[PDB]
Every structure is written in structure tokens, then in C-alpha cells.
Amino acid sequence: MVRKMRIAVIDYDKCNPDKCGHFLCERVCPVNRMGGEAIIIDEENYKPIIQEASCTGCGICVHKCPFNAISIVNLPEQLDEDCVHRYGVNAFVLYRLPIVKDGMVVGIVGPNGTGKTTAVKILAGQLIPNLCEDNDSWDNVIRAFRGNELQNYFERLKNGEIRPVVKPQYVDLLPKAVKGKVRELLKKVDEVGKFEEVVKELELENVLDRELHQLSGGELQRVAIAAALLRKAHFYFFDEPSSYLDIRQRLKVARVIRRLANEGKAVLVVEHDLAVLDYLSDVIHVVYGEPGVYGIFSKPKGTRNGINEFLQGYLKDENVRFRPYEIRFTKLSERVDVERETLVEYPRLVKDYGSFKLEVEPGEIRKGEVIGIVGPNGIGKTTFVKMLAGVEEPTEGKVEWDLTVAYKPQYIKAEYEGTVYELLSKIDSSKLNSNFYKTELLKPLGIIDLYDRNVEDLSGGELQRVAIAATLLRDADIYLLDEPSAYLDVEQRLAVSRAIRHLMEKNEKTALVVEHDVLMIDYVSDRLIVFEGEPGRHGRALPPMGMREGMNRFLASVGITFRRDPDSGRPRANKEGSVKDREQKARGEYYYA
Amino acid sequence: MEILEEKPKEGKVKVKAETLDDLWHLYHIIDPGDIVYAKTLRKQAQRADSLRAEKVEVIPVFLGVQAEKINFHKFANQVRVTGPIVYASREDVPLGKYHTIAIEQGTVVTIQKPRWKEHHIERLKEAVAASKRARVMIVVIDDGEADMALVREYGVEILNSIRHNLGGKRYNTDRESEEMKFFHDVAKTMEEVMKRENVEKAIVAGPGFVKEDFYKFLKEKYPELAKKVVIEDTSVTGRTGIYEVIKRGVVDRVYQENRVAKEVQLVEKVLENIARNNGLVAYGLKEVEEAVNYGAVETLLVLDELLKGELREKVEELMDAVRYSRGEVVVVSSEHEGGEKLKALGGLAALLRFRVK
Ligand SMILES: Nc1ncnc2c1ncn2[C@@H]1O[C@H](COP(=O)(O)OP(=O)(O)O)[C@@H](O)[C@H]1O
Ligand SMILES: Nc1ncnc2c1ncn2[C@@H]1O[C@H](COP(=O)(O)OP(=O)(O)O)[C@@H](O)[C@H]1O
Ligand code: SF4
Ligand code: SF4
Numbered sequence: 029m030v031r032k033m034r035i036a037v038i039d040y041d042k043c044n045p046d047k048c049g050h051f052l053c054e055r056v057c058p059v060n061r062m063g064g065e066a067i068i069i070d071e072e073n074y075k076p077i078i079q080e081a082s083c084t085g086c087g088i089c090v091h092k093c094p095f096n097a098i099s100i101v102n103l104p105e106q107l108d109e110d111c112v113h114r115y116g117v118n119a120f121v122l123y124r125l126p127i128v129k130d131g132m133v134v135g136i137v138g139p140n141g142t143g144k145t146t147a148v149k150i151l152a153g154q155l156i157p158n159l160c161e162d163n164d165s166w167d168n169v170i171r172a173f174r175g176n177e178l179q180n181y182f183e184r185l186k187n188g189e190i191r192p193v194v195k196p197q198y199v200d201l202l203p204k205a206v207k208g209k210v211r212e213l214l215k216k217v218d219e220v221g222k223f224e225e226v227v228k229e230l231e232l233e234n235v236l237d238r239e240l241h242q243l244s245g246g247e248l249q250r251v252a253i254a255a256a257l258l259r260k261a262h263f264y265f266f267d268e269p270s271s272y273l274d275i276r277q278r279l280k281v282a283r284v285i286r287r288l289a290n291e292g293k294a295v296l297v298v299e300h301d302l303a304v305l306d307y308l309s310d311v312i313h314v315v316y317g318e319p320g321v322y323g324i325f326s327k328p329k330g331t332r333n334g335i336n337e338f339l340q341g342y343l344k345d346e347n348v349r350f351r352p353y354e355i356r357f358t359k360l361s362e363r364v365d366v367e368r369e370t371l372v373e374y375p376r377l378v379k380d381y382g383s384f385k386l387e388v389e390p391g392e393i394r395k396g397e398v399i400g401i402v403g404p405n406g407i408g409k410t411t412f413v414k415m416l417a418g419v420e421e422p423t424e425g426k427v428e429w430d431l432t433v434a435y436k437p438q439y440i441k442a443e444y445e446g447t448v449y450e451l452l453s454k455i456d457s458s459k460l461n462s463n464f465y466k467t468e469l470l471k472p473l474g475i476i477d478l479y480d481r482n483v484e485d486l487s488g489g490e491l492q493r494v495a496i497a498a499t500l501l502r503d504a505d506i507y508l509l510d511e512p513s514a515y516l517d518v519e520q521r522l523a524v525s526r527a528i529r530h531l532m533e534k535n536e537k538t539a540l541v542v543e544h545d546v547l548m549i550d551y552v553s554d555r556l557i558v559f560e561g562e563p564g565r566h567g568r569a570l571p572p573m574g575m576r577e578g579m580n581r582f583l584a585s586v587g588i589t590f591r592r593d594p595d596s597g598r599p600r601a602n603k604e605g606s607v608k609d610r611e612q613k614a615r616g617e618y619y620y621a
Numbered sequence: 622m623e624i625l626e627e628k629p630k631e632g633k634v635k636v637k638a639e640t641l642d643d644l645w646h647l648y649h650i651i652d653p654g655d656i657v658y659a660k661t662l663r664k665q666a667q668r669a670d671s672l673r674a675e676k677v678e679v680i681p682v683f684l685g686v687q688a689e690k691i692n693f694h695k696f697a698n699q700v701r702v703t704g705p706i707v708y709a710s711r712e713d714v715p716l717g718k719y720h721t722i723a724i725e726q727g728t729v730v731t732i733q734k735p736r737w738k739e740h741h742i743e744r745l746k747e748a749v750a751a752s753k754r755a756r757v758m759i760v761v762i763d764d765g766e767a768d769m770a771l772v773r774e775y776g777v778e779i780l781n782s783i784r785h786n787l788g789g790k791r792y793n794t795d796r797e798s799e800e801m802k803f804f805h806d807v808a809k810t811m812e813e814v815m816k817r818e819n820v821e822k823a824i825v826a827g828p829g830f831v832k833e834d835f836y837k838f839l840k841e842k843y844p845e846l847a848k849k850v851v852i853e854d855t856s857v858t859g860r861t862g863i864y865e866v867i868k869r870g871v872v873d874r875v876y877q878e879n880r881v882a883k884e885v886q887l888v889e890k891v892l893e894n895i896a897r898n899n900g901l902v903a904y905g906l907k908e909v910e911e912a913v914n915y916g917a918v919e920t921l922l923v924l925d926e927l928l929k930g931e932l933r934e935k936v937e938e939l940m941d942a943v944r945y946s947r948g949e950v951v952v953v954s955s956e957h958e959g960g961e962k963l964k965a966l967g968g969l970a971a972l973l974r975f976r977v978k
Pocket of ligand 2: 244381382383384404405406407408409410411412564
């Protein structure tokens with residue numbers, strides 16, 4: 029048997045006809061060579077267009093494109109009949125949708141730019157599906173999804189007796205769009221009559237006094253979680269709420285979102301941290317494809333199986349490979365943990381601004397290792413990191429030595445005129461051009477494809493990857509990253525992990541990665557700094573300690589114990605009040621790698 | 622085809638058709654203003670009463686038909702030429718009618734009254750009478766004789782019929798130094814013919830040990846030109862032993878496919894890697910037309926369907942010019958792993974020696 033359609037997508041935001049000669053396409057194109065119309069020129073909007081009705085799918089044009097603004101795929105003709113939306117020819121296409129459901133929490137996992145957000149607009153009444161045809165009605169949608177639960181969704185959606193509220197993929201829009209306080213706002217947006225429960229469970233009663241612009245990450249995020257629920261809506265769609273929440277927060281916010289299911293309200297969630305995902309969801313979707321060419325949502329799965337299958341890279345329900353190797357993790361017995369040479373040591377420091385107090389106990393820094401920083405936000409993880417960084421001078425003690433520090437700040441904002449390549453190039457041209465930084469850093473984080481746009485003209489997730497890469501291409505003794513986790517997806521999060529681990533181990537250098545995402549910690553960490561006290565008041569930084577002994581020490585203050593999943597190997601969070609929860613906590617070992 | 626030219630003026634030729642391409646040759650020569658005589662059969666229609674009833678008939682023998690249209694038909698493999706009769710037997714008086722006929726296998730005479738051109742006589746002789754080849758090189762080596770044949774569609778002949786004059790084991794042990802001598806001779810004669818005819822395998826077959834015995838000796842003597850042993854069926858020798866080896870032995874057809882297929886994909890890989898090199902790839906009617914005139918094309922790879930396209934003339938010329946320049950031109954099935962990419966590439970791909978812009 030056989031059957032096959034060709035599908036061409038050109039990321040125009042990457043095409044530039046004047047730089048590659050004169051549309052390198054039509055020139056290099058074999059079909060056009062022999063008097064054909066595979067690639068046509070839009071001599072007006074000045075773009076190239078591939079008439080899929082021709083294109084043999086030989087892929088010559090793809091290899092030639094000086095950038096990589098072309099993708100040509102040969103489909104078996106099947107998924108093509110389940111086609112949802114095309115943004116015009118040579119443009120992004122969606123196949124299938126996530127199946128939302130009442131009274132249940134429908135999970136989503138899968139890398140950015142695969143039209144997670146495309147589906148949200150579709151469901152929000154603000155975009156009619158064309159079903160990759162020409163449609164501008166609901167009725168063909170309702171038919172196409174006949175045999176499935178989403179027909180019923182589009183019928184209600186059109187009567188307009190449901191409207192979903194959406195927590196946007198980037199936040200930090202509400203501070204520059206909505207002025208005055210968190211106190212104020214939360215009265216205004218109120219319509220659900222559940223004001224009391226929300227503000228208390230998400231612990232924003234201290235956070236009312238400050239204005240939006242004065243918030244820290246964890247707080248701003250949570251205040252959006254609050255204001256979305258106080259708007260009246262049955263359907264709540266959270267895109268990336270894991271941004272900037274700490275370990276303590278993200279587990280507690282998960283409980284808050286889960287309590288919605290019991291109230292019988294429909295939650296749809298994107299999460300990129302498997303422990304948090306396991307815990308919330310009841311259905312799970314995998315989304316596969318290469319970003320910006322196509323995305324296809326898989327069939328709904330039961331959370332556990334769905335996650336297993338994501339890790340394997342092979343779908344047994346759909347028969348699709350989408351990653352040619354497996355997601356994997358590092359215990360502590362899959363390493364050599366041997367002692368190394370002391371780089372520097374720091375005595376007792378104590379910094380008091382007079383609006384937070386920190387005491388740092390005496391500690392050793394070793395060379396060649398990767399230290400993870402853990403604790404809840406405002407516990408002065410950041411105050412410590414900034415004392416070595418030079419932006420803050422210790423009140424007492426010394427950390428500011430003849431180590432050079434490379435500093436990735438907590439927020440990201442751009443102030444740089446010129447391209448991604450200008451910005452990096454002036455730091456160390458040399459590094460950019462070597463094969464290691466190309467295998468480990470630049471190439472898998474997409475930066476080769478990003479050199480053409482300005483820094484200001486990059487979006488949050490691309491720009492994050494760009495900041496991270498920048499900080500590690502600085503020439504330093506010791507590398508300081510404050511919270512790189514924010515706006516990274518699962519695959520990205522992992523890629524940054526393998527890059528940090530390799531680069532630091534090879535040149536035997538120190539890095540501090542302030543961390544809160546379970547998986548990155550699980551792979552990268554050699555040693556740990558657990559923070560305690562009461563946040564927003566006092567923090568006590570306890571000296572560096574082993575990875576296991578640290579996650580043990582800390583997990584016991586969160587009530588939440590972690591196992592090792594037996595299906596394919598991942599961090600398994602155990603429900604507070606379970607067999608494993610009870611066995612770990614009784615036996616003083618609160619964690620396994 | 623097989624040609625016999627029976628008259629020095631081409632007033633009598635005797636021609637045949639065995640293969641699809643032979644007919645295309647026969648088409649290409651035959652025009653308006655020829656008469657072909659042949660040897661068909663055209664029937665009558667008779668008789669009848671006072672009025673009209675049922676009844677028909679048939680007859681046999683040759684004839685000639687004038688050329689009035691020249692038409693070429695698929696799923697039939699037959700070139701029809703229609704129009705008026707002018708030669709028949711008269712014993713019944715059956716003249717006074719037209720009569721279509723088809724040029725096929727068996728005798729077909731061609732003549733042209735204003736008299737043929739150089740191009741016409743040349744076209745005929747272009748297809749080679751003896752054998753154009755396909756492999757067409759089979760051996761059978763048994764205790765009593767060594768045999769070795771050239772079996773083409775155009776005719777069929779055991780090339781060597783030399784005798785061992787010896788047993789396998791029956792006269793004594795027969796592991797003579799006149800057996801060692803014999804085998805060396807056998808190998809030599811086969812080696813010289815195989816190269817000369819330019820088809821590169823032979824199938825050895827035989828009884829008992831003997832077939833194997835010989836392959837072992839060939840490999841041990843010199844590195845081969847490609848040799849395979851197949852068991853096949855043998856339990857006779859002479860014309861019918863060679864004939865029996867060929868009949869159940871789709872070995873011939875299957876091997877000839879695998880060898881052509883090999884050549885395309887070897888070249889295919891090369892084109893991939895050359896495309897990276899600046900100015901040494903040609904591809905794309907204009908580019909290829911441009912190297913071929915400047916005489917710098919090493920290899921021309923074209924799927925056979927493009928030869929039978931809608932533009933056919935250009936393709937042949939590009940090949941003709943390259944072959945004259947001592948490139949090699951490759952004509953290959955589109956079923957193949959390499960052939961399917963020459964469709965995609967568009968049709969023409971060529972490897973250059975040196976840059977043509
Ligand atoms: N309005 C748009 N016009 C053109 N392309 C878009 C648009 N919105 C998103 N895309 C492209 O669609 C792809 C997937 O989009 P998105 O839904 O934002 O992905 P995800 O949520 O997985 O990050 C990306 O490559 C993105 O650039
Ligand atoms: N210059 C300052 N003056 C007064 N308070 C400050 C100053 N800088 C930071 N703070 C306060 O210190 C507390 C902790 O700060 P920080 O170390 O940035 O926390 P985190 O753990 O979230 O990184 C916050 O309550 C913050 O408002
Ligand atoms: S798609 Fe690539 S090669 Fe074609 S015009 Fe755009 S930039 Fe040039
Ligand atoms: S894939 Fe091949 S055939 Fe299709 S547009 Fe590109 S070069 Fe032309």
C-alpha cells in the first residue's frame with residue numbers, strides 16, 4: 029500500500045529573498061528547472077510560495093535555504109483529513125485539537141510553537157476553524173468531530189453560553205496595562221463570590237499591599253491565577269503557570285487548581301514539569317511535530333500512560349516516533365561523586381537590607397561541580413547570588429573575590445540594539461565558532477536560526493534561551509544563573525540541563541543554578557544549598573551539602589515525598605496521604621533520585 | 622531485430638520483430654510511399670441468396686499493401702498500415718478491395734520506389750542482427766563436456782561444445798594434470814568471451830560435485846568478474862541441457878535488473894555529494910544542455926520514461942553528444958531506489974568533469 033501528500037511550510041519570519049540571491053528557491057528547484065511551478069514568487073508581498081500540488085518533496089530547496097525558512101514533509105494521507113486550521117498556504121497548519129471535558133483537568137505536554145496557543149484562540153470563539161479548506165462556520169466543525177466529545181463544545185461555544193478565561197503564555201502584561209493595586213484589582217475582576225477562598229489558599233493577603241509592578245515572579249504569577257478564577261467562566265485555560273513559581277509554591281498551586289475538579293469546573297493546563305503534571309491532570313495530550321511547520325495533538329490518554337509514552341518518544345496508540353532517542357535521568361549511582369579541589373571558601377555573611385534579613389553559614393565552593401540552589405522565593409537565594417555578583421556589597425563577610433562572575437538576572441528585559449549575533453559575538457567570538465558550544469548550547473536551543481532578528485525582536489522563550497547562552501559564553505571563573513527555568517518547555521528544560529552539565533564538567537568550572545523545577549535538579553545537581561527560615565522575613569542559608577542529603581532535608585519541610593516511577597524512570601511525586609508518602613516520611617528518607 | 626538483406630538495392634529485405642523496440646525501429650523506417658509485402662491472411666465474405674443471410678469465410682498466403690497511414694498500437698505490439706491491395710494470388714479472383722496488415726515476426730519485405738536514403742538503410746542496421754544482448758552468456762560444465770552459449774532472442778547457438786574427454790571420477794580418480802590443464806583452458810576462453818561481449822556473469826550448473834568444484838577453481842585462479850553458482854536443473858547436456866538451464870531460470874532476467882540498478886544508485890550517491898561542490902553538478906534542462914555542448918559531462922543519468930516523453934528528440938541528442946565525447950550514458954528502470962529519484966530531480970542529472978557555468 030501507499031498514499032502520500034506533500035506539505036510545505038515556510039517560516040517567512042526567517043526568509044529574506046535579497047540575502048540568498050534572488051529567491052534561491054525557484055533557482056535551485058528541480059521542478060522549476062524543467063519548466064514547472066513547484067515554487068512561485070509573490071512579487072508583491074515579496075515572498076516565495078510552494079505549490080504543494082507540484083513539489084516532488086525532493087527537498088533540495090530545504091537544504092539550500094541559507095537559513096532554514098523551509099520545511100517539506102511527506103505525509104501518508106490520513107492525518108490530513110483531521111486538519112483543523114491553516115494560516116494561508118506556506119504557513120502554519122494545525123491538526124487535531126485537545127479534547128476538553130467537564131469536571132476534569134485535561135493536561136498538555138509538548139514543546140513550544142506546536143500551536144498550543146493556536147488551539148486556545150480556536151476554542152475562545154475568536155478564531156473559526158477553516159479545517160484546512162476555506163470554512164468560516166461552526167457547522168462543518170461540529171460534523172468533522174462527529175464521533176467525539178468536541179462537537180458538543182463547538183455547539184455551546186456558538187450559542188455563547190460558555191466563554192473560557194485564559195491565563196496567557198506570557199504574563200507581565202497586567203502590570204503594564206492595569207495600574208493600581210493587587211488589592212484593588214481583585215475586588216474589581218470579582219464576579220464568582222469565591223473571593224475569600226482564592227486569596228487565602230493562594231496566600232496573596234500580604235501581597236495585596238504592593239502594586240502590580242512591585243511584585244516578584246512567584247507573586248505576579250499567582251495574582252494572575254487569582255484574577256482568572258474571579259472572572260466568571262466555566263472553562264479555565266492555564267498556559268505555563270510554572271513560570272517563576274518556586275518548588276514550595278508550584279506544589280501548593282497545583283492543589284488549588286486540582287480543587288476546581290471537585291467544583292465540577294473544566295481546567296485545561298499546560299505544564300512542563302512531570303511531577304506537577306501527574307498531580308493535577310486526569311487526561312493528558314501529547315503534542316508532536318517540529319515547531320512552526322505543523323503540530324498535531326494525539327488521542328486523549330490516562331495521565332500516567334500518556335507521560336510514559338512521551339518519554340519513550342514512541343506512540344503505540346498512534347504509531348508515531350517524534351524524537352529518535354529517549355528522555356533520561358541521572359541517579360547518583362550513575363556518576364562518579366569523588367571529592368575535588370576547593371576553588372574558594374566563604375565565611376559567615378549576614379546581609380540585612382532592613383526589609384529582609386539573610387545569614388549565610390560558612391561554606392566551601394568546589395571546582396568542577398554544579399550546585400543547585402533550592403528554597404521558597406524571597407528567602408534570599410537571590411540576596412546570596414547578588415552578593416557574589418557585585419550588585420550588592422555584603423554588609424559583613426567576603427564573597428567578593430578575584431573570581432569573575434557571570435550573571436543571568438531573574439527577569440528578562442532587553443536593552444540591546446542589534447542582533448542576537450552582535451550581542452553574543454562581542455563576548456567571545458571564539459566560543460561561538462568552536463564545535464563544543466555548537467553541539468551543546470547553540471544548536472539545540474535554536475540560536476543559529478535566530479542570529480537574523482534583533483534582541484528586542486525576540487520573544488520570551490527564544491530570548492530566555494538567548495540570555496542563558498549569553499551568560500555561559502561569558503569568560504568567568506564562576507557562573508550565576510538566577511532562575512533560568514522561566515518560560516522553558518520540557519525539551520528545552522532538559523537541553524539546558526545537558527548543556528550546563530557537559531560544559532561545567534569538561535572545563536571543571538562552578539556554576540550555581542537557582543532551581544525549582546524538579547527534573548533539572550534531578551539531572552544536574554552534584555551539590556545543593558537548602559534554604560530555610562520563614563520567607564519575606566528571615567532566611568538562613570545552610571552550608572552546601574550532597575544532592576540526596578539536600579533534597580531529603582528540604583522535602584521534609586514541604587510534606588511531599590518523591591519516589592522513582594517503575595514504568596520508564598522519572599521523578600514520581602507521591603500524593604500527600606498515600607502508602608509511599610507514609611513509608612518515606614516514617615523512615616526519615618524523603619527522597620530518592 | 623534479425624535482418625537478412627536479400628537484395629543489394631533493398632528491393633527484397635527480410636526483417637522480423639521480436640521486441641517492442643524493434644517495432645519502434647520498423648515504425649521509424651516505414652513511411653507513406655512504401656509497399657510491404659508480408660505474409661498475412663485476408664478473407665472474403667460471400668455468399669448469399671437472392672437477398673441476405675448468414676455465412677462467412679477465411680483464406681491464407683501473403684500479399685502487399687500500399688502505405689497510406691502508419692499507425693502504432695499499444696497492448697497488441699503491432700504497427701498497422703492500411704490502404705489498397707495490389708498484390709495477391711488470383712485463383713479465386715479476390716482483387717478489388719483494401720486490406721490492412723500488421724508488420725510482425727516472420728517475413729516482412731520493404732521497398733521504396735523513389736529509393737531509400739542512407740538514413741533509412743542505417744536505421745534498420747542500427748538494431749544489431751546477431752544480438753544486442755542482455756546476458757545471454759550461460760555455461761554448463763558436466764563431466765562429459767564443457768558448454769557455453771549465446772542465447773539471444775534473435776538466435777541461439779552453443780559457442781563452445783569442447784569435450785573434457787575424461788570422467789569426473791569414472792575412469793580412475795580423474796584428478797589429472799590434464800584436468801588441471803583443462804579447467805585453466807575453460808576459464809581462459811570464458812574470460813575472454815565474457816569481457817568481449819561485455820555481459821558480466823555466467824551461471825555454472827551440473828551434476829554432483831562438479832559445478833561447485835569449478836567455481837572454487839575460478840576464485841582460486843584469479844579474482845572473478847562476477848560468478849555465481851546456481852543449482853538449477855541439469856541431468857542432460859548438449860543443446861537441451863543448456864536449454865533446460867535457461868527455461869526455469871529467471872536467474873537471467875533477475876540478475877540483469879540487479880546489475881543496472883547497481884549502477885544508477887552508485888552514481889546517485891555521487892550526484893548528492895557533487896551537488897555541494899561548486900559548478901560540477903549539472904541538472905535542470907538549461908544547465909545540462911549547457912555542459913553537454915561544451916563537452917564536459919562525465920555521466921548522463923536519465924530515467925527511461927524521459928526518453929519516451931513528449932520531448933524525446935532533445936534527450937537522445939544530449940545522450941548522443943555525450944557518448945561521442947566519451948562519457949557513459951545510463952538508461953535505467955524507474956522502479957529502482959535510484960530511478961525514483963531521477964523522476965524527482967526532474968529527469969536529467971549529470972556529473973561534470975570540470976566546471977561549466
Ligand atoms: N499568529 C500567527 N501567525 C503565524 N504563525 C503563528 C502565529 N501564532 C503562532 N504561530 C506559529 O505557530 C507555531 C506554534 O504556535 P503556538 O501555538 O504559539 O505554539 P506552542 O504553544 O506550542 O509554543 C509557532 O511556530 C508559531 O510561530
Ligand atoms: N534594596 C532593598 N531594600 C529593601 N528591601 C529589599 C531590597 N532588595 C530586596 N528587598 C526585599 O528582600 C526580600 C527578598 O529579596 P530577594 O532576595 O530578591 O528574594 P528571592 O528569594 O525572591 O530572590 C523581598 O521581600 C524584597 O522586597
Ligand atoms: S525561503 Fe530561503 S532561499 Fe527561498 S527566498 Fe526565503 S530565504 Fe531565500
Ligand atoms: S522540495 Fe524539491 S520539488 Fe518541492 S519545492 Fe523544493 S526543490 Fe522544488
